[PDB]
Amino acid sequence: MASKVVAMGVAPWGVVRNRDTLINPKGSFPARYRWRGDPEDGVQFPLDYNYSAFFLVDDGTHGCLGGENRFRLRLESYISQQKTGVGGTGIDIPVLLLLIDGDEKMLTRIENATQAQLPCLLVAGSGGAADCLAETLEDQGEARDRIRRFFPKGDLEVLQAQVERIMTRKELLTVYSSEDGSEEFETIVLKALVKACGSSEASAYLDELRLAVAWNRVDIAQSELFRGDIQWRSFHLEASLMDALL
Amino acid sequence: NDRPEFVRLLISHGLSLGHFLTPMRLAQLYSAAPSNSLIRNLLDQAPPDVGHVLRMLLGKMAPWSDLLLWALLLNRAQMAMYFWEMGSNAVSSALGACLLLRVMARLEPDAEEAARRKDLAFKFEGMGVDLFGECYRSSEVRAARLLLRRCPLWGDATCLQLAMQADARAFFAQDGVQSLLTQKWWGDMASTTPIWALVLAFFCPPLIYTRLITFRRCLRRWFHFWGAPVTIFMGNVVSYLLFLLLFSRVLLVDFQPAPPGSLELLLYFWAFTLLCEELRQGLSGSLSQRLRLYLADSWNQCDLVALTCFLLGVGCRLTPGLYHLGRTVLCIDFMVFTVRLLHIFTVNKQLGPKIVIVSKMMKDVFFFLFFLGVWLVAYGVATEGLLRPRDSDFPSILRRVFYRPYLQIFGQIPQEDMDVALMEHSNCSSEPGFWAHPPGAQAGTCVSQYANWLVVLLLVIFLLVANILLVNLLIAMFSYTFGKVQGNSDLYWKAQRYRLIREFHSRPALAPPFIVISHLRLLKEAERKLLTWESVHKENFLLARARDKRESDSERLKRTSQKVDLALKQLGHIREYEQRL
Amino acid sequence: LVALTCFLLGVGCRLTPGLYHLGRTVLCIDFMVFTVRLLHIFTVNKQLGPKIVIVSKMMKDVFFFLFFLGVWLVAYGVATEGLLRPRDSDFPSILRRVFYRPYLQIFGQIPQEDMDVALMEHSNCSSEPGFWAHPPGAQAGTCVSQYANWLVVLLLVIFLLVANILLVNLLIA
Amino acid sequence: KENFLLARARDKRESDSERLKRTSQKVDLALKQLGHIREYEQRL
Amino acid sequence: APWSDLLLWALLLNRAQMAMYFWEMGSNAVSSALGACLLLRVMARLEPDAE
Ligand SMILES: [Ca+2]
Ligand SMILES: [Ca+2]
């Protein structure tokens, strides 16, 4: 309203209310969804109305959680390996995952994503499953695992093994410094993106450059993108220069 | 306990204000007024019982808003700023806060608490100006059209009305407000039309249909041209000048004891038309509230005084035995109208602030009149006692005491009426001593010459004091006043521009003398979206300001000092670790 | 260019048999223009250079003060002329007593004998009702009404104050 | 022109604000390295 | 020389920093600076914004 940004929904098929209103084999171009029903249950939930598109994963269940983690992770990974149109003539579309609190299942999700080589960002003070990893990155470990997370599963050393596995690939995880209500992390996103690439081919770093241009993180771009490691060509920077001028 | 940073921190960490604030809680907050504070006095004079006090102050004509009002009333700067930072109507709230703070400050007796209130009002006005500047930069149409020309819940009055009441000239001084005002001032015509082009087209109505003026089509164009407030202003200026010319003609030539002539009747009709126009302005600009608003404008007061004097003059002249009194009061009324003519100079940037300068210098003239009255009484009584003139008639005494020295201030020094060496000695009166016969008509038949050197000495001292010391004291006051309102000349002119545009935007399209026919003719989700857009831009503005603050030298120094303290602590820790192993 | 055009017009007018006076007048004005033009040479000196710019800028302030003074003079002069009711009432004389006389009053030329009635000898001037006085001034009207003369003196006092101090010092500021 | 610009940039680099910024970032790097060496010592 | 054109564009659009940068690597430094001052003053006197 203050203006483009698009919101995409990925929810299990089975926790959405009034499903029968959304069944049509011959086509459902029109549809009316009752998203303000009086009854309320802990299983079924109403769809939001601010999202431009929805994805309902069907796992053959009448209600549950975690049935979309695998599909969501696969989709994110595929996006991470896709160009921004024009076939291969475009450039890779950056991707990352933002973590805010969670539980043991959320920690497993983070571990799977990291093993998929997708950047993840954690926010300090969110709560369990997010602050614990932030503290681990900043750094007793067992005591913290029991403290920052509820008693259940705390004794389970599988949590310790998961934390160790996360640390094994800390190159992707990045903590969010609140900095007393900083409310500014574009630089953090760029830093995560640059530290999550490593390899310098000058053809996969264009997207980070375009993001930096879109923002005012010139210092970040100079420090990493134009640190001399990468072999920037002439035609490479034409579009970025035009954008910066405009 | 007025802990601004701490309250911000507490609210930041997951505290629901809506579920927190309660009528009892708010009552306690207001009861936290400091001892015998101004707000405490107002509350006692008037449950929180806060609506009545606000209606009394302003005129009566979401927890965040309530907390903001409470902070403003108790004069807590930081908490008020924080509450405004996360309000609903950012610009309207800022202007309303400035208004309320200025009113309370002018009403406060502390003389230093008033200073703090005025400073807080200035800060709020600056914040509102910056926020609206950003809003205008983002989208001129949205901000201009909707944000300003909207009646909020604060007082059910447009933001511009709040700015005018608060005298927030800095607000009127920005680009968006002035662009909107100019667009209104030129109506449907292009704001870039040359002034000379408009003036030339005014006297050649057919010419408007050419490329000279930039905007069936014929009638639309004609009404657009003649309905534009600028054209109405030019027409009213012409008609007012013609009215003054007619008034002077009648007064100087056509005024006779005989019954009124044709020109005098035309003047009466013209004055009646002006009276009808002023009545329309008062009655359509809550009848008592509208009347009070109308009378609150100085120009309207001048118009009423002029019309009342004119009515009295006409009545007196029509009476068989009051012709001279009627003529005199009409002369004074003409003077009043001519002074009223100054209102039109506000349209020009160079002449705009000069009206304010003159108005302010009038007070200095008043105080200098106090001083000069004291000094004139002293000197005049002394001289009159010394001379002992034999006329001694009370009007003559008042003349020689007050009037004559007053002219002496302006180079009119009647030596022949005071010096005795310049007068022929004569045996005037049987009283003992010597007497002289001044040649002046109102200088007394004959004055005593006993101690005349003292009269000349007093004349010398009076010339010195009056003509230099006091006159230049007054001139120094004038210079100080001028300098005070010279660095802000633009702000004053912008405020006057707004007042003029508002006045002429709601006036009949016809000039006074013909305005009789015009008088006879007289006889939502969008707001949600607009407020969300405003709030988004407010958040951007605050974020940018905080980013700038973080990059300040003092902040960098503080951050690096604390960080290096952490580094030193870690260095000690690692040194101890190495020592152990 | 202005100076040369005025000079040419003056020469042409004088050469004509029946325009000698007009030619002489325009030549006088042209000489004034040339003498003012003479200021251009002062720019060579550091002390006198900026003063030309200062004068040029102060001309605009004089213009605006002329606006203000015109308003105030019209007010005061019309008021006084209405109060006095001089019997000459000739249009050039009316313009004189309205604009010219107050303007000189700004500069210390206060003709009391032409306004005060205590300073004039009473006479039976005109058949109109009321009392009349005969001012001694040549262009002050043959005889003025003395009905409400204290008001004329009060207006004179107010005008002296306002003009001679407030407005003049506004211009000086 | 190049000499003038270079001199102006040199002066700017020596400004107090620039010195403060540079030393702050440099000491941030130093603190990061100190943490790195502390972790290294901890491992061994 | 593209630098002169970019400088003119920056001056017309009133982009301070970019105009300064383009001037920093122009051809006729002094003449360009004076011309830019001239053009900016003319536009400012012609502009209606007042800010
Ligand atoms: Ca990449
Ligand atoms: Ca009015």
- What does residue C86 show for φ and ψ, rounded to 5 degrees? -60, 145
Here the contacts of C129-136 (C-beta below 8 Å, separation 24 or greater) are C129/B257, C130/B324
Measured distance CA(A12)–CA(A71) in Å, rounded: 10
Alpha-helical regions (H) of B250-297: 262-283, 287-295
CA E46 to chain D, closest CA, distance in angstroms equals 31
- What does residue B487 show for φ and ψ, rounded to 5 degrees? -65, -20
Q: What radius of gyration, in Å, describes the C-alpha atoms of chain B? A: 34
Measured CB to CB, residues of chain B less than 8 Å from chain A are 12, 529, 532-533, 536-537, 543, 546-547, 550
C169: left (phi over 0), alpha (psi -120 to 50) or beta: alpha
Measured distance CA(C30)–CA(C10) in Å, rounded: 8
Give which of C26, C30, C117, C40 is closest to C80, Cα–Cα: C117
Instruction: Report the 10 Å Cβ neighbour count for B72.
Output: 26
DSSP state of B167: T
DSSP state of C165: I
At A138, list the tokens.
């900043």
Distance (Å) from CA A9 to ligand 1 centroid: 24
Q: How far apart are the first and last CA of chain C?
A: 34
Q: Cα A120 vs. chain centroid, distance in angstroms?
A: 6
At B423, list the tokens.
């007068």
Report the residue of chain C nearest B484, measured CA to CA. C173
> Which ligand is closest in space to the CA of residue A118?
1
Q: What is the 3-state secondary structure (H, E, C) of B471-514?
A: HHHHHHHHHHHHHHCCCCHHHHHHHHHHHHHHHHHCCCCCCHHH
In a 3-state reduction of DSSP, which class is residue C123? strand
**H or E element: which one contains B327?**
helix B323-340
Distance (Å) from CA D1 to ligand 1 centroid: 40
At E17, list the tokens.
């920093």
- Contact (CB, 8 A) for A74 and A96: no
Q: What radius of gyration, in Å, describes the C-alpha atoms of chain A? A: 21
CB contact under 8 A, B253 and C128: no
- Whether the CB of B468 is below 8 Å from some CB of chain C: the reply is no
In a 3-state reduction of DSSP, which class is residue B426? strand
Tokens 């605009």 locate to C60
CB contact under 8 A, B546 and A183: yes
Taking every pair of C-alpha atoms in chain E, what is the biggest distance, in angstroms?
34
Q: Which residues, 6+ apart, have CB-to-CB distance to B64 below 8 Å?
A: B17, B83, B86, B87, B88
Buried b (16+ CB within 10 A) or exposed e, B116-153: ebbebbebbbebbbbbbbbbbebeeebbbebbbeeebe
In a 3-state reduction of DSSP, which class is residue C145? strand
In a 3-state reduction of DSSP, which class is residue E28? coil
CB contact under 8 A, B532 and A2: yes
- Whether the CB of E16 is below 8 Å from some CB of chain B: the reply is no
Method: cryo-EM
- Whether the CB of D16 is below 8 Å from some CB of chain B: the reply is yes
Touching B: which chains, 3+ CB pairs < 8 A?
A: A, C, D, E
- What does residue A176 show for φ and ψ, rounded to 5 degrees? -100, 115
The total number of residues written for chain C in this structure: 173
At A108, list the tokens.
């497993």
- Contact (CB, 8 A) for A153 and A104: yes
- Contact (CB, 8 A) for A169 and A115: yes
Give which of B56, B59, B61 is closest to B38, Cα–Cα: B56
Measured distance CA(C22)–CA(C80) in Å, rounded: 36
- Whether the CB of B174 is below 8 Å from some CB of chain E: the reply is yes
Distance (Å) from CA C136 to ligand 2 centroid: 44
Instruction: State yes or no: A47 annotated in a binding site.
Output: yes
DSSP state of B468: I
Measured distance CA(A157)–CA(A145) in Å, rounded: 10
Measured distance CA(B371)–CA(B353) in Å, rounded: 28
Q: How far, in Å, are B256, B262, B302, B323, C116 from residue C76 at the CA level?
A: 21, 26, 17, 21, 16
Q: At A178, which amino acid appears?
A: S
CB contact under 8 A, B574 and D38: yes
- Contact (CB, 8 A) for B405 and B380: yes
> Which ligand is closest in space to the CA of residue B282?
2
Full strand arrangement of the beta sheet holding A97-99:
A97-99, A120-123, A173-176
Of A1, A2, A181, which has the smallest distance from its Cβ to B12's Cβ?
A: A181
- Contact (CB, 8 A) for B58 and B100: yes
CA E29 to chain D, closest CA, distance in angstroms equals 7
Q: At what angle do helices A131-138 and A157-168 cross, to 10 degrees?
A: 60
CB pairs under 8 A between B and D: 38
Instruction: State yes or no: B303 annotated in a binding site.
Output: yes
CB pairs under 8 A between D and E: 3
- Contact (CB, 8 A) for C22 and C29: no
Residue B365: exposure state from Cβ atoms within 10 A (0-12, 13-18, ≥19): middle
- Contact (CB, 8 A) for B388 and B426: no
CB contact under 8 A, C76 and B335: yes
D5 CB neighbours in chain E (<8 A) are 24
Reported as half-sphere exposure (CB side, CA atoms, 13 A), residue B17 has a value of 15
Measured distance CA(A230)–CA(A204) in Å, rounded: 10
DSSP state of B77: H
Q: At B500, which amino acid appears?
A: L
Measured distance CA(B215)–CA(B186) in Å, rounded: 10
> Which ligand is closest in space to the CA of residue A94?
1
Tokens 């008693």 locate to A151
- Whether the CB of B398 is below 8 Å from some CB of chain D: the reply is no
Reported as half-sphere exposure (CB side, CA atoms, 13 A), residue B435 has a value of 15
CB contact under 8 A, A2 and B533: yes
A184 CB neighbours in chain B (<8 A) are 543, 547
CB contact under 8 A, B560 and D23: yes
CA B529 to chain A, closest CA, distance in angstroms equals 6
Touching E: which chains, 3+ CB pairs < 8 A?
A: B, D
CB contact under 8 A, E50 and B192: no
Measured distance CA(C13)–CA(C18) in Å, rounded: 8
Give which of B468, B466, B424, B474 is closest to B449, Cα–Cα: B424
- Whether the CB of D1 is below 8 Å from some CB of chain E: the reply is yes
Report the residue of chain E nearest D4, measured CA to CA. E24
Measured distance CA(C132)–CA(C125) in Å, rounded: 6
DSSP per-residue codes, chain A: -------EEEEETTSBS-GGGG--TT--SS-----S-S---SS-BPPPSS-SEEEEE--S-SS-SSTTHHHHHHHHHHHHT-BSSTGGGS-BPP--EEE-S--HHHHHHHHHHHHTT--EEEETTS-TTTHHHHHHHH--HHHHHHHHS-STTTS-HHHHHHHHHHHHTTTTEEEE--TTT----HHHHHHHHHHTT----SSSSHHHHHHHHHTT-HHHIIIIITSSSS---SGGGHHHHHHHH-
A177: left (phi over 0), alpha (psi -120 to 50) or beta: beta
Q: At B378, which amino acid appears?
A: A
- Whether the CB of E46 is below 8 Å from some CB of chain B: the reply is no
- Contact (CB, 8 A) for A134 and A122: yes
CB contact under 8 A, E51 and B192: no
Q: Which residues, 6+ apart, have CB-to-CB distance to A152 below 8 Å?
A: none
Distance (Å) from CA A57 to ligand 1 centroid: 29
Instruction: Report the 10 Å Cβ neighbour count for C82.
Output: 23
DSSP strand pairing (A120-123 vs A97-99) = parallel
CA B123 to chain E, closest CA, distance in angstroms equals 21
- Contact (CB, 8 A) for A119 and A192: yes
Measured distance CA(C143)–CA(C138) in Å, rounded: 11
Resolution of the structure, angstroms: 3.2
Q: How far, in Å, are B54, B169, B286, B532 from residue B58 at the CA level?
A: 6, 19, 15, 28
Give which of B224, B199, B220, B221 is closest to B210, Cα–Cα: B221
DSSP strand pairing (A8-12 vs A53-57) = parallel
CA D28 to chain B, closest CA, distance in angstroms equals 8
Q: Which residues, 6+ apart, have CB-to-CB distance to A135 below 8 Å?
A: A144, A148
- What does residue B169 show for φ and ψ, rounded to 5 degrees? -60, -40
Measured distance CA(B324)–CA(B288) in Å, rounded: 38
Residue B89: exposure state from Cβ atoms within 10 A (0-12, 13-18, ≥19): buried
Q: Which residues, 6+ apart, have CB-to-CB distance to B21 below 8 Å?
A: B63, B66, B67
Measured distance CA(D9)–CA(D15) in Å, rounded: 10
- Contact (CB, 8 A) for B130 and B138: no
Best residue in B550, B555, B562, B563 for a mutation probing chain A (most A CBs within 10 Å): B550
Distance (Å) from CA B115 to ligand 2 centroid: 35
Q: Return the bridge partners of A56, or none.
A: A11
